[PDB]
Amino acid sequence: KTAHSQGIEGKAMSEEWARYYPRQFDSWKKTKESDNITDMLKEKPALVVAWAGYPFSKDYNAPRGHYYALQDNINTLRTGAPVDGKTGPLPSACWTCKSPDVPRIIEQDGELEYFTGKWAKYGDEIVNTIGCYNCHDDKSAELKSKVPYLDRGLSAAGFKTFAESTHQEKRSLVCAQCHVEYYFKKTEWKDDKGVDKTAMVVTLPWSKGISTEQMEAYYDEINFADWTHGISKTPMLKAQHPDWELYKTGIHGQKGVSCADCHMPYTQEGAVKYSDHKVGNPLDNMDKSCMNCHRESEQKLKDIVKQKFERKEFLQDIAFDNIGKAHLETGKAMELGATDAELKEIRTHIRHAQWRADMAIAGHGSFFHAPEEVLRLLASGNEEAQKARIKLVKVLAKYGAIDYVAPDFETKEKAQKLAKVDMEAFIAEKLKFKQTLEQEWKKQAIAKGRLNPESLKGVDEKSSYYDKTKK
């Protein structure tokens, strides 16, 4: 048994586990070191055109340390600027994979109630970032999945549930609670007091399997769309960090190497043996993350990984350039009078092209986890995009614009202009929110004893729109 077999008071605050596990706590807090903010819209402006009409066209950055998960969720322009617990653009489900307070609230008020309402609803309750309680039982300290949608997805796909999986499988599944692709399923229900409510439930699109094509069939079957494209009016699908799905069928995944083997390698200091909890870039310490299984040179392995990234970049830029042009050319055809019937096939191609390309790039480590599937997906997506463009030439020609040249979107500024994103307004409104309601959330959370000031150190120094220099 553990030294806390009856549980841990205040379990949602990771600091509460420190007295029992100083090593794991100290390494866990070190993800604070990964504070870089890479603005993906700035690096890949084609993404702005791809996501026109959707929140990702406003703000989208690369992943950084777990230490910043909650604050980034608050800072992203995607969550907008609520003025109370009933306003703001996004639902409560947006907190789900950012805090140990989520399982706390779910175990308290239930899954449906948790998924009901606005993101702003839990502003002064969900205040701790990815912690011990997201992956560990507070009595046995054993690995556990705290989100019901994971098992439901696993079962639907023909996989064993978390409880029925091997220990090695669990070392990856704890990550899969969050590092997977999902969608929100509008779910109607009624609470104990007889009140009819509507929940937006996190759902893994795995009922037909976890391949990109199977998920595609899943979404098409239910005629689902995350949004109607702002330029092409195509019914779009948004892929979000399908890290586990892509990893699962990559060679390491097929071999049984777990996320933890590379990202949380075992370490030994003296006679002390434990798992490095500083989840980050495995290449930072290859002797612990790679050289236990590989006998070659570290530099050679790093050069190989770099090559994989370069291949992905090559195909990514091609696919999204054609996807972007397709969206714009469809928008031009629309302006000229093209009917929905004339654009149906084209829009279907675009929907599929971007779903495949986004699934390939949304998982930031996929270029390494599953290189070959990533390249195949980008090639497949590009082909669908070009099929759409070949057809668009004919539609444009019919309306007298065969020589139309889709506008360029090589800078974030130009792309957001094409996507009609009023950044100045969004940023101004966001800053107001941060200076008022956000501070009230934190003040109240601290007053109630749900949040310890210590955890906020250097947590709000950067975002894609401001930089106090370094988080």
Write out the binding residues: 66, 94, 97-98, 132, 135-136, 175, 178-179, 181-182, 238, 240-241, 252, 259, 262-263, 277, 290, 293-294, 369
Residue 341 CB, nearest distance to ligand HEC (Å)? 33
Choose among 108, 260, 114: nearest CA to 184.
114
Q: After which residues is the chain broken (C to N over 2.5 A)?
A: none
From candidates 252, 311, 376, 398, binder to ligand HEC by CB under 6 A = 252
Of 106 and 132, CB closest to ligand HEC: 132
Q: Which of 274, 399, 404, 465 is in the footprint of ligand HEC by CB under 6 A?
A: 274
Burial-class residue 249 by CB neighbours within 10 Å (0-12, 13-18, 19+): middle
Choose one: 239-247, 307-315, 334-342, 365-373; the region binding Ca ion (CB under 5 A): 239-247
Angle subtended at Cα 245 by Cα 240 and Cα 248, rounded to the nearest 5 degrees: 150
d(CA 471, CA 467) in angstroms, rounded, equals 8
Least Cβ distance, residue 25 to a second copy (angstroms)? 36
Backbone angles phi, psi at 143, to 5 degrees: -65, 140
238, 351, 389, 412: residue in contact with Ca ion (rule CB under 5 A): 238
Q: How far apart are CA 133 and CA 275, in angstroms?
A: 16
The rounded distance, in Å, linking the Cα atoms of 130 and 100 is 6
Listed in sequence order, the DSSP H helices in 264-406 are 286-289, 298-336, 340-361, 366-369, 371-398
Classify 130 as helix, strand or coil.
coil
DSSP 268: E
Query: Could you tell me which stretch among 109-117, 215-223, 228-236, 287-295 binds ligand HEC (CB under 6 A)?
Result: 287-295
For residue 347, the minimal CB distance to ligand HEC (Å) is: 24
Residue with tokens 């929110």, as numbered in its chain: 433
The string of DSSP codes covering 200-217 is EEEE---BTBSSHHHHHH
* 235 vs 371 by CB, closer to a second copy: 371
Beta bridge partner(s), residue 188: 198
C-alpha span between 133 and 115 (Å, rounded): 19
**Does 131 sit near ligand HEC (CB under 6 A)?**
yes
Q: Which does 268 bind (CB under 5 to 8 A by kind): ligand HEC, Y ion, a second copy, none?
A: Y ion
351 belongs to the binding site for Ca ion (CB under 5 A):
no
CB of 460 to ligand HEC, least distance (A): 11
| Parallel/antiparallel/unpaired status of strands 266-269 and 235-236 | unpaired
Minimum distance between the CB of residue 369 and ligand HEC, rounded to whole angstroms?
A: 5
Amino acid found at 335: E
Residues 178-217, interacting with Ca ion (CB under 5 A): 183
CB of 238 to Ca ion, least distance (A): 5
In the complex with Ca ion, the residue whose CB is nearer, 136 or 238, is 238
| Residue 394 interacting with a second copy (CB under 8 A) | yes
Smallest gap from residue 295 Cβ to a second copy (A): 10
How far from 353 is each of 49, 227, 237, 325, 449, CA to CA, in Å?
14, 15, 10, 12, 48
Task: Return the residue of 16, 101, 261, 358 that touches ligand HEC, per CB under 6 A.
Answer: 261
Q: Decide whether 367 or 409 has the Cβ nearer to ligand HEC.
A: 367
Amino acid, res. 10: G
Stretch that binds ligand HEC, among 154-162, 166-174, 333-341, 446-454 (CB under 6 A): 166-174
Q: CA–CA separation, 441 vs 255, rounded Å? A: 45
Question: Is 15:452 a contact under the CB 8 Å cutoff?
Answer: yes
Q: x/- binding map, residues 407-446, to ligand HEC, per CB under 6 A?
A: ----------------------------------------
In angstroms, give the least distance from the CB of 448 to ligand HEC: 22
* Residue 361 binding ligand HEC, by CB under 6 A: no
Site string for a second copy, 282-301 (x = CB under 8 A): --------------x---x-
Q: Does 279 engage in binding with ligand HEC (CB under 6 A)? A: yes
Nearest-CB residue for ligand HEC: 365
Out of a second copy, Y ion, Ca ion, none, what residue 382 binds, judged by CB under 5 to 8 A for its kind, is a second copy
- List of residues contacting Y ion (CB under 5 A): 16, 63-64, 268
> Any idea what the Cα angle at residue 101 is, between residues 100 and 102, rounded to 5°?
85
User: How far is CA 142 from its chain centroid?
Assistant: 25
Sequence length of the chain is 471
